Amino acid sequence: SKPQPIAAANWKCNGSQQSLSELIDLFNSTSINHDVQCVVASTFVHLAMTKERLSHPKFVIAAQNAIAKSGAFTGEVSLPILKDFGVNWIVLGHSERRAYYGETNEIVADKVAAAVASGFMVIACIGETLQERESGRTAVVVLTQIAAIAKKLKKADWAKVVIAYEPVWAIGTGKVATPQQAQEAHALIRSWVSSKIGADVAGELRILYGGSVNGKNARTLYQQRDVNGFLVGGASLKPEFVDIIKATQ
Amino acid sequence: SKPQPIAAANWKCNGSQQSLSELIDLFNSTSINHDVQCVVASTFVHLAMTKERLSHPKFVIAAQNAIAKSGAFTGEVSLPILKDFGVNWIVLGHSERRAYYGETNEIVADKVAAAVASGFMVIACIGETLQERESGRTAVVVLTQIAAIAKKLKKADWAKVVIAYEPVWAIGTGKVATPQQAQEAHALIRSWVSSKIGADVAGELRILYGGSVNGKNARTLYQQRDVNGFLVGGASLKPEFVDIIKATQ
Numbered sequence: 001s002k003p004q005p006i007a008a009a010n011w012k013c014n015g016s017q018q019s020l021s022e023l024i025d026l027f028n029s030t031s032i033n034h035d036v037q038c039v040v041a042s043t044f045v046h047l048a049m050t051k052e053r054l055s056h057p058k059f060v061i062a063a064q065n066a067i068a069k070s071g072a073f074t075g076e077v078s079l080p081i082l083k084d085f086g087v088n089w090i091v092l093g094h095s096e097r098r099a100y101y102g103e104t105n106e107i108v109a110d111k112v113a114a115a116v117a118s119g120f121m122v123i124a125c126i127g128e129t130l131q132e133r134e135s136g137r138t139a140v141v142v143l144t145q146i147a148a149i150a151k152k153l154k155k156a157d158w159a160k161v162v163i164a165y166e167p168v169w170a171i172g173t174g175k176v177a178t179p180q181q182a183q184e185a186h187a188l189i190r191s192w193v194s195s196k197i198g199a200d201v202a203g204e205l206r207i208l209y210g211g212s213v214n215g216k217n218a219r220t221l222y223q224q225r226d227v228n229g230f231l232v233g234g235a236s237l238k239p240e241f242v243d244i245i246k247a248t249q
Numbered sequence: 250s251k252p253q254p255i256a257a258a259n260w261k262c263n264g265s266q267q268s269l270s271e272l273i274d275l276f277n278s279t280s281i282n283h284d285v286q287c288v289v290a291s292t293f294v295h296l297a298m299t300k301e302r303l304s305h306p307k308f309v310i311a312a313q314n315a316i317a318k319s320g321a322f323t324g325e326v327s328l329p330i331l332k333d334f335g336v337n338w339i340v341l342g343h344s345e346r347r348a349y350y351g352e353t354n355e356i357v358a359d360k361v362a363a364a365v366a367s368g369f370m371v372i373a374c375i376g377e378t379l380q381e382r383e384s385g386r387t388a389v390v391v392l393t394q395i396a397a398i399a400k401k402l403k404k405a406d407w408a409k410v411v412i413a414y415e416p417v418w419a420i421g422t423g424k425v426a427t428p429q430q431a432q433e434a435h436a437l438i439r440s441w442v443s444s445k446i447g448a449d450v451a452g453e454l455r456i457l458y459g460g461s462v463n464g465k466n467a468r469t470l471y472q473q474r475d476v477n478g479f480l481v482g483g484a485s486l487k488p489e490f491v492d493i494i495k496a497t498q
């Protein structure tokens with residue numbers, strides 16, 4: 001017995017009106033018969049189009065980032081802005097952002113807290129590098145990530161949180177990650193939550209696999225005990241995302 | 250005589266749907282009797298609502314930032330995405346991006362270069378901080394900034410560039426630079442431009458003032474030989490933006 005799965009599509013910084021419109025269309029067609037939460041996370045610029053055009057009852061929209069308050073932050077987009085706009089979902093603290101845009105754990109932690117406080121469903125990202133992994137530092141890092149986030153949350157706040165574990169060590173590196181390696185990590189996050197936050201929170205918590213997933217492997221990855229869905233990059237700009245959703249039962 | 254002035258609104262990370270509709274209705278209501286190019290830079294999230302609703306022939310819509318190419322940059326927007334969406338103007342290198350989000354002169358220069366390659370009209374922000382001004386270093390700072398941009402740009406490119414001079418210490422503080430401070434700063438930029446690029450280019454270039462511009466101060470700032478207009482933060486969220494516009498006459 002698992003919680004409700006989530007098939008999240010992180011379109012990242014990609015797409016055109018034309019190409020996206022098409023994909024939206026493929027999606028609304030999809031017959032999904034089980035309890036799953038489909039999430040399409042578009043660029044800020046594509047939100048409106050996606051909003052109007054996505055009609056499927058299992059699909060909800062997410063933004064790929066946000067700052068906490070409004071004000072003088074040229075080029076940024078805030079939680080109030082998003083909330084007014086009718087977005088209740090958010091990806092926070094992705095790998096690409098921690099790398100290229102200076103997202104310390106504490107910045108992420110703060111963002112998650114702000115979001116949770118504004119009523120969003122947060123897909124908060126954690127995950128270690130090839131360097132970190134290699135040097136025997138996996139658990140230390142992942143637990144620190146989750147702990148930093150954990151601090152600012154009250155127990156009741158966990159209902160608003162989804163964790164996506166990203167194997168950074170396996171992305172762009174050459175390395176392969178097996179379903180047992182996903183699961184090793186997944187189970188260690190849940191361990192942590194169970195232990196510090198509580199078994200009841202633990203049981204309900206969605207831990208999405210945030211690494212390389214496609215139509216071929218998603219069923220297998222899904223087979224694992226602590227894999228509750230996916231945060232999809234590549235395969236999300238594609239028709240196979242539909243197999244990704246199916247693979248969640 | 251002078252080049253065609255610009256009056257740009259930098260809404261920054263601010264706004265509500267209804268609030269912006271309102272300004273836009275006002276803006277559409279306004280009869281701009283003189284040749285001025287009016288710009289509205291709204292958040293990414295509102296580019297749709299701005300583009301669809303903003304009717305006035307003297308107004309363009311602009312983005313507050315972008316990255317050069319599309320790819321795996323979760324949270325970010327690229328030039329190609331903006332170009333696709335019918336946005337042809339961009340504000341780049343803003344003080345708040347340089348400060349908070351580590352945008353170096355290198356980064357700005359690269360962004361600008363790419364933006365002009367892709368056929369955008371670019372408002373490039375340059376300006377010293379309080380510390381530098383008090384240290385006597387303003388000259389060095391502004392030139393280094395302008396020269397960085399210059400490196401990446403060949404002659405013709407200049408046609409699509411607009412230079413915004415915004416002293417950090419005047420950004421939403423109340424400390425509007427005097428007309429004398431602005432005019433000496435603006436002249437310096439132009440004397441560097443004529444020297445390095447060409448006199449032909451220097452007379453064509455627009456150089457804008459930004460930092461604590463309101464309806465009151467605007468007319469005098471504008472009277473200075475080398476002041477081609479304004480980049481307005483705060484007063485752009487108000488009906489006084491209109492006053493600032495009429496000030497470029």
Ligand SMILES: O=C(O)CCP(=O)(O)O
Nearest residue numbers: 420421460461481482483
């Ligand atoms: O930084 C800007 O672009 C304008 C700052 P102000 O709000 O003082 O006009």
